[PDB]
Amino acid sequence: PLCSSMTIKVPTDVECTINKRVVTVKGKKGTLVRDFSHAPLDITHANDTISVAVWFPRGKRNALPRTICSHIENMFKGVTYGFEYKMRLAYAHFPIAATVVDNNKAIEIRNFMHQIKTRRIECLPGVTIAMSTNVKDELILRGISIEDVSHTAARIHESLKVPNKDLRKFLDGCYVSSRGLQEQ
Amino acid sequence: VIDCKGHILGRLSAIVAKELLHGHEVALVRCEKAIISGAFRDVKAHYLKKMHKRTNFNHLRGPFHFRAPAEIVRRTIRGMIPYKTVRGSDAMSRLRVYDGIPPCCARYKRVVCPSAMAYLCLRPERRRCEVGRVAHEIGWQHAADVERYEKRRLEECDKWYQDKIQIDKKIAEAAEKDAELQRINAELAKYGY
Amino acid sequence: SHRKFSCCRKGNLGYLPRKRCTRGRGRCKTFPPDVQGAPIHLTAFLGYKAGCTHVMRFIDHRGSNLHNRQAIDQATIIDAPPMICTAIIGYAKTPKGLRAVTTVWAAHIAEPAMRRFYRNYFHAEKTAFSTYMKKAADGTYIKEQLGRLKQHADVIRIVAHTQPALTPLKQKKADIMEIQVNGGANVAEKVDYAYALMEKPISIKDVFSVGAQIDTISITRGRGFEGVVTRWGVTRLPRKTRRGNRKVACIGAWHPANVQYTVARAGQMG
Amino acid sequence: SYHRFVEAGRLVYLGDGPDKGKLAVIVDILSTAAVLIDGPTTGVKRQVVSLRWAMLTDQVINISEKPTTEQLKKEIEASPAIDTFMNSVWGKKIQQQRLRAKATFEDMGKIAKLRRERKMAMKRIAMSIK
Amino acid sequence: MQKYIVYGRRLPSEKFPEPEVFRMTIYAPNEIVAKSRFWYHLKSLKKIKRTHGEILDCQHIEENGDFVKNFGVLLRYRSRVGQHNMYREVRETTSARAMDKVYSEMAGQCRARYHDIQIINVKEVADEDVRREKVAMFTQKGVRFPHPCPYVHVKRAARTARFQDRAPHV
Amino acid sequence: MEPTLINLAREYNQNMMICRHCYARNPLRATNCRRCRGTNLRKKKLS
Amino acid sequence: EEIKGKTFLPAIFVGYQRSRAKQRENVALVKVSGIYTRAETDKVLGRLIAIIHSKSGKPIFGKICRPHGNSGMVRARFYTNLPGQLMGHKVRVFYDNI
RNA sequence: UCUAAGCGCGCACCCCGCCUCGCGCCCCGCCCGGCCGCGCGCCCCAGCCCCGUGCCCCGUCGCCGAGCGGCCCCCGCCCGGG
RNA sequence: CUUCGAUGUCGGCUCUUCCUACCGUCCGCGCGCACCGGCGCGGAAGCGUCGGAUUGUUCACCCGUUCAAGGGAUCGUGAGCU
RNA sequence: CGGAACGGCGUCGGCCGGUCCCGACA
Numbered sequence A: 001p002l003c004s005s006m007t008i009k010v011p012t013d014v015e016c017t018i019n020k021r022v023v024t025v026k027g028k029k030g031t032l033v034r035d036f037s038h039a040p041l042d043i044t045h046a047n048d049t050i051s052v053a054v055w056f057p058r059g060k061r062n063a064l065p066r067t068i069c070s071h072i073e074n075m076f077k078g079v080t081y082g083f084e085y086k087m088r089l090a091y092a093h094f095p096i097a098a099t100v101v102d103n104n105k106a107i108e109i110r111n112f113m114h115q116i117k118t119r120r121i122e123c124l125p126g127v128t129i130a131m132s133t134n135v136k137d138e139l140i141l142r143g144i145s146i147e148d149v150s151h152t153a154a155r156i157h158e159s160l161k162v163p164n165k166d167l168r169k170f171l172d173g174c175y176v177s178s179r180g181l182q183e184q
Numbered sequence B: 001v002i003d004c005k006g007h008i009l010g011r012l013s014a015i016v017a018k019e020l021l022h023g024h025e026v027a028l029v030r031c032e033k034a035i036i037s038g039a040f041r042d043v044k045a046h047y048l049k050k051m052h053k054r055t056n057f058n059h060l061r062g063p064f065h066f067r068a069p070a071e072i073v074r075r076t077i078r079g080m081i082p083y084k085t086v087r088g089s090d091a092m093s094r095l096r097v098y099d100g101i102p103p104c105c106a107r108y109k110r111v112v113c114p115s116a117m118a119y120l121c122l123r124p125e126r127r128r129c130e131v132g133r134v135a136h137e138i139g140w141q142h143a144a145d146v147e148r149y150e151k152r153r154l155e156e157c158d159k160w161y162q163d164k165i166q167i168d169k170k171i172a173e174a175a176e177k178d179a180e181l182q183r184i185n186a187e188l189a190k191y192g193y
Numbered sequence C: 001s002h003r004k005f006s007c008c009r010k011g012n013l014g015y016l017p018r019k020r021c022t023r024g025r026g027r028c029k030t031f032p033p034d035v036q037g038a039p040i041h042l043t044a045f046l047g048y049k050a051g052c053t054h055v056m057r058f059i060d061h062r063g064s065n066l067h068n069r070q071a072i073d074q075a076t077i078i079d080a081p082p083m084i085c086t087a088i089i090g091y092a093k094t095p096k097g098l099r100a101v102t103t104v105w106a107a108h109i110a111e112p113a114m115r116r117f118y119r120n121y122f123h124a125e126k127t128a129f130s131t132y133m134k135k136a137a138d139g140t141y142i143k144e145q146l147g148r149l150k151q152h153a154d155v156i157r158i159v160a161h162t163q164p165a166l167t168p169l170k171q172k173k174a175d176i177m178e179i180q181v182n183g184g185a186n187v188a189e190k191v192d193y194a195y196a197l198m199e200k201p202i203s204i205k206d207v208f209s210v211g212a213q214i215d216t217i218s219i220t221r222g223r224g225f226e227g228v229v230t231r232w233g234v235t236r237l238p239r240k241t242r243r244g245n246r247k248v249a250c251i252g253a254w255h256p257a258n259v260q261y262t263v264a265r266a267g268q269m270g
Numbered sequence D: 001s002y003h004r005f006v007e008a009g010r011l012v013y014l015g016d017g018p019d020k021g022k023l024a025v026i027v028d029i030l031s032t033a034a035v036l037i038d039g040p041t042t043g044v045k046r047q048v049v050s051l052r053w054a055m056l057t058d059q060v061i062n063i064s065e066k067p068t069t070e071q072l073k074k075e076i077e078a079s080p081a082i083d084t085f086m087n088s089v090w091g092k093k094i095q096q097q098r099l100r101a102k103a104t105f106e107d108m109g110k111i112a113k114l115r116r117e118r119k120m121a122m123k124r125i126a127m128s129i130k
Numbered sequence E: 001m002q003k004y005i006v007y008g009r010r011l012p013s014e015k016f017p018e019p020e021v022f023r024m025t026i027y028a029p030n031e032i033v034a035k036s037r038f039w040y041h042l043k044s045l046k047k048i049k050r051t052h053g054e055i056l057d058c059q060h061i062e063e064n065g066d067f068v069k070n071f072g073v074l075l076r077y078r079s080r081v082g083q084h085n086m087y088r089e090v091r092e093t094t095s096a097r098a099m100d101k102v103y104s105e106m107a108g109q110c111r112a113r114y115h116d117i118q119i120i121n122v123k124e125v126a127d128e129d130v131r132r133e134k135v136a137m138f139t140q141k142g143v144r145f146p147h148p149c150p151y152v153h154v155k156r157a158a159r160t161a162r163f164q165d166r167a168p169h170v
Numbered sequence F: 001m002e003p004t005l006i007n008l009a010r011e012y013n014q015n016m017m018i019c020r021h022c023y024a025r026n027p028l029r030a031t032n033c034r035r036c037r038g039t040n041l042r043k044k045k046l047s
Numbered sequence G: 001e002e003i004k005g006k007t008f009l010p011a012i013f014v015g016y017q018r019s020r021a022k023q024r025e026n027v028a029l030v031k032v033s034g035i036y037t038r039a040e041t042d043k044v045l046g047r048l049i050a051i052i053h054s055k056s057g058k059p060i061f062g063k064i065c066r067p068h069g070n071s072g073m074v075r076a077r078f079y080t081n082l083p084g085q086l087m088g089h090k091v092r093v094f095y096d097n098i
Numbered sequence H: 001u002c003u004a005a006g007c008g009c010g011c012a013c014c015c016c017g018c019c020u021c022g023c024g025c026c027c028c029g030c031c032c033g034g035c036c037g038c039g040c041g042c043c044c045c046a047g048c049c050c051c052g053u054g055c056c057c058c059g060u061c062g063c064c065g066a067g068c069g070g071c072c073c074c075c076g077c078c079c080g081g082g
Numbered sequence I: 001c002u003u004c005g006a007u008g009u010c011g012g013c014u015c016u017u018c019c020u021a022c023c024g025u026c027c028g029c030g031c032g033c034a035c036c037g038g039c040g041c042g043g044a045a046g047c048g049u050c051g052g053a054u055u056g057u058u059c060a061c062c063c064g065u066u067c068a069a070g071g072g073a074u075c076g077u078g079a080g081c082u
Numbered sequence J: 001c002g003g004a005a006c007g008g009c010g011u012c013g014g015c016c017g018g019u020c021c022c023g024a025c026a
Helices: A064-080 A148-160 B009-021 B040-052 B069-079 B086-094 B129-140 B143-172 B178-188 C111-116 C131-136 C142-151 C187-194 D069-079 D081-087 D089-101 D106-129 E029-044 E094-108 E133-139 E151-160 F003-013
Strands: A007-008 A015-017 A022-026 A029-035 A049-051 A085-086 A098-101 A106-112 A117-123 A127-131 A138-143 B028-029 B035-037 B126-128 C046-050 C055-059 C069-073 C078-080 C083-094 C095-105 C155-162 C176-182 D010-012 D023-029 D034-039 D044-050 D054-060 E004-010 E022-027 E053-060 E069-078 E083-092 E117-123 F017-019 G011-020 G023-032 G048-052 G059-068 G075-076 G090-093
Touching: A007 A064, A015 A064, A015 C069, A022 A064, A022 C083, A029 A064, A085 A148, A106 A148, A127 A148, A138 A148, B009 B069, B009 B086, B035 B129, B040 B129, B069 B086, B069 B129, B126 B129, B126 G048, B129 B143, B143 C083, B143 D106, B178 D106, C069 E083, C083 C142, C083 C176, C083 C187, C095 C142, C095 C155, C142 C187, C142 E069, C155 C187, C176 C187, D010 D034, D010 D081, D023 D044, D023 D054, D023 D069, D054 D081, D081 D089, E004 E029, E022 E029, E029 E053, E083 E094, E083 E133, E094 E117, E094 G075, G023 G059, G048 G075
Parallel strands: none
Antiparallel strands: A007 A049, A015 A022, A022 A029, A085 A138, A098 A106, A106 A117, A127 A138, B035 B126, C046 C078, C055 C069, C083 C095, C083 C155, C155 C176, D010 D023, D010 D054, D023 D034, D034 D044, E004 E022, E004 E053, E069 E083, E069 E117, G011 G023, G011 G090, G023 G075, G048 G059, G048 G090, G059 G075
């Protein structure tokens, strides 16, 4: 008789539909689809309040209701307001040069520690890379999916790595200034 | 003829091996979709570990390892069969193992063994992986080919289904006949079947 | 105990078994990749090695001692007589691999290709292709087979024969080989290109370009039974060694109690 | 987990046990893996049976708490659920399955011939349609 | 498993004309185990060995199974490290049935056999006092839970019917 | 470098806890290391 | 034959009754189709069965005697002991008498 | 909070390709025959869409034809030169 | 314990394979990590671990170089040698 | 999976000492 249930009130602007464990959220910025068929979940639409509900929560099935609930809420805020990760380039001596090679779909970084290697990072589909005039050496990543934009920003941070040296002494690279929830 | 899609390899093999010893001829299709329980990380290590044992002096005289998902199933059943004996060799001869549904077994009637199937055999939360993916990693090169031919065969099977549906309706219209007497006896004589 | 001193093994185990080649001549096995959307081209040609020459050339390798200098290099001339296409074969990428979807032969096959199909031409029935020429020669039968290849074949190849008469060697039978047609927009475009070349000589200039790199497949020179010093490149033992020095001294350990496939042993050399 | 909950009064079908093949009502939950079942009109006596034997039918009987046996029989008799289940596909099959069990080796012979008459009659019907 | 109230006394002696009659309630599979467990407790508690004592009666108690009742058992068990005390609540129809449930859970989780577990107290706990969450879960009147194991039915049916035309839906 | 940039850079390169046995970068408030599963964490020596 | 019209219930001769060490070739373990339980075997007990000899194409008559195990296999005795090349071959439990 | 679900990257290692061999098999040629079998939905299982069956007779009366799916058959040397 | 009507005794030379308890190169992480260069750790056995002086010597010590881990296989290897 | 002292916020089951609506400075 044990159920770990978490209920999230769907925003009126968002229109979402759940078939099986596939949740499809429609929003003003765009439409997103996630699949949670890995976990055993009894997600019930029930108008605004969506109950994830995991029956018989033995051990880590007690963690599934809140994780899935939060993901479906991230989906809601992604397609209503959009996620805006900001990335700050941190040059000590040689200014790293960033160019948006595609239609906001690729970023190329040069002169990182005077490296001849050119790092081109292709963005995940549905995320746009921009350059911010106000901050200076700031990249703006904008998408409707929290994971897609964050994975792109992690890839940019990894693409620029000091090979050896002391990391505590040489602190150069893109380091993610702001988490997001501002623009599509 | 057994569709192996979704069947635990050992549980299916135990059923197949006794059936082959009992003189039944068994043909297995969609062998690539049989499921081995446990994480791919460890299932693949356990298939690489077995491919390590080869006769040091000549590997041509050593244990052979079959990358093919259908030949993996055969080797499993061979372990559960007295192959060295002539009784065992004959039951191995009646086994036919095939990745994908081949043209030879395309129109044969396929049965499933629900006990062997993974959905009833392993808890949800237990990681499981098809033998087709372990095969590709150990070195099977026909996964793309077997998928291309399976997808096109399923498009044809869809067209056949629609014709089958219309044919089945036209059999039901003719299900009125002496069949009614057979029905009366096979139920209303208390027989019940 | 350990080997005491570190030394590599002698020979590539990948080239075992070192046996006389069963295949009559060099075989292509894997052709170059199709690269669909490229220009339609033939990937292979057969020729007979004539001999070497030595040429002086101007090196333009930037970043080298020879940049803007002249070098004398060994060059091998391979006499390549034109090869006449005699048949088109189409293969499909089945779950069991490339499987032939039939070969359509030409309406008229040359005498050198015919000679290949018999052990002795003079004392032979000469019955090969007799029915086929009657079925064909109108082109209708050939066209139906080409259409079947367009519908079911994924890889198109041409079967061509070297004309041995144009070469100095004492052969008379032609060597027949399959040359993969590559660079096709469609399989049917590949069949059309192949049909144009049917019963038609193909030239090296129209297969390969100057400055391009090729892979040369052939059976090597033979030396017959050779010793492990001149077969595997093992060290000759000191001249004090009784019972001869041209031998591997220890062919293995007590355990495994059977000689291994690694250990060097005398046999066929070329 | 959408429907067919293990609740009080749910009609149950015994898949295994001495009373296999019969319907019962869950009088009370003993645990996650056991229930107290009793079916007086179906002849199942009150016992605690593992939920692993019980199969949940779609019908639920409206009963009072602590049903007892006599009050439970009165409630089961009032409910139309028992007959609704029997008229349903599972119930009609359950009735056929009971008749199949009451069959001797001789009644297997008559049932095997009749089945082969069906096998060949169906082939004649199928061929004639085509 | 059966529930036996066993009575026993020391043999009557010139030193004491009527020794004290002792009464214990022992849950055992049979009467011979119940009289053995009686003397094991009597030997330690009152220094009475079986040779020095008599069994006045071993009365078997019959318990009604009409209603599920919350039961509470206080026991002591020996693990390899040393002895420990443990309170377990189980909801069962009869007290013997609840003791069987307690013995099976102790064997399954604590790996303790019948002989190394002594049952200090077995009581019927009220619905209000249920320290164990599991018993408290079913105590509330409305307890709709989806079938815990509907996979078992299809797997069991498939033992007789090894080969089926379709894979069964649960 | 700009001072804020040095701070931001430090969050990912200087602020972490290293379990002595596992030598694994670990969260600042980590009771047990992700890989070593041990309580002997240290605060990462400053430059 | 004498079994030409007899309807028969299908079965297989799986093996002789045996232990890993010792095999009793006198009793033959037969699996009867439709019998999956030991109680169900009682229906087929004391029934005339026949296995067609491969060499002569002639039925070897036998009678089912006792149940072999809880899974419905039965122990049967035949006029001649079975050759052993007939393992896995079908035996016929006739629904009609003799 | 890098992990529990989920996800990205990732080793001179591993596996594969390229290569060395290769049982068999495929296509064609010559020749163009014999033999044998009769039986197709798919997906999913925390929607499981109504389940919890069917088959239960490979001779036991079934064998036509057709359509598919197979199997078999068959291809010399001596001699001279390399 | 087994081998005495017999299992060729060390070191070298030759040649093969294997192990990791990895010295260098590979992948990370740490440092009393500015760089250079060390050092510690986890994965990693693909490749390299040589040329000589004295000594029967394994060992040892020394010179030199692209600076040089440790072992196992009847103390691998005598119808192979010396 | 022969195995030790020692570790483990892996998952369960207890034992004991406490604090929760004097919300476990507002």
